[PDB]
Each structure stands twice: as structure tokens, then as C-alpha cells.
Design a protein around this ligand. Sequence first.
Ligand SMILES: CC[C@H](C)[C@H](NC(C)=O)C(=O)NCC#CBr
Ligand SMILES: [Cl-]
Length: 130
Amino acid sequence: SMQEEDTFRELRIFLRNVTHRLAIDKRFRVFTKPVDPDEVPDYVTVIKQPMDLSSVISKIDLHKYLTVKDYLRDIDLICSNALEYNPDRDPGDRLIRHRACALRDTAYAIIKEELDEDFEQLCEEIQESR
Ligand SMILES: CC[C@H](C)[C@H](NC(C)=O)C(=O)NCC#CBr
Ligand SMILES: [Cl-]
């Protein structure tokens, strides 16, 4: 229905706004673009599901997210990819892990404050109905 398409449009507007707020944060600059194989050719071999905020914006616009839970699965991948690829005790790896966890925690905190639970439940019920 048009009412359902309106619902998903509102979801996309909400997700673009959350994703913009993460992308303009200076801590999260490393997560705004895909890893360049040039610098990191072993990346694509270790990390099977690369994810970054530019890929998230592309997916919103392709209507790949029908619920905030599907979006958060991709935010969680940005974090878990960084924890897996950069596990060492040296400061460069610890800084990327801290920034990755901070990205994830910031996205969850914005959604806890600003997502209406009944809106998410409506999205889930339309998605399950398809
Ligand atoms: C691509 C692997 C790399 C070792 C790591 N990045 C990620 C996303 O894991 C990192 O240390 N980034 C440095 C910079 C910049 Br912009
Ligand atoms: Cl830096």
C-alpha cells in the first residue's frame, strides 16, 4: 500500500540522518570509505563482509533496509570487522577498535533516544508480511 511505502520512506529518512551524524564525526573518518586494497591487500582475504558508512548510505537508497534491526546488523559489522582485523595490543589497533566500538555505541544510543518502538514494530510487521 502507499501507507506502507510512506512507512519505509520515513525509515530511509531516519537512517540517512543517523548515518550522516556518524559520518561527520571526526572519530569515524576511517569508517566513511571502503578499505583501499592498495594499502591493505590482505583485508579482502580476511574480512568476508567489508562494510563502511558509504556502503550503508548506498544500501539505504537501494531499499535494502526494511527495519532498523537490519541497519544495525550492518553497523555491528563495521565494529566486528575492525575488532577481527585489528586485534593486537599496539596503539594503532587499540585506537581503531575503540573508534569502532564508539561508532556502534553511538548508533545504538541515537536509535534508543530517537526511534519510536511502535514505528520499528510497524516496519517489522510489514517486512514479515512480504
Ligand atoms: C584497513 C585495515 C587497517 C589496518 C585499519 N582499518 C580498518 C577499517 O580496519 C586501520 O588501521 N586504518 C588506518 C587508517 C586510515 Br583512513
Ligand atoms: Cl587520527
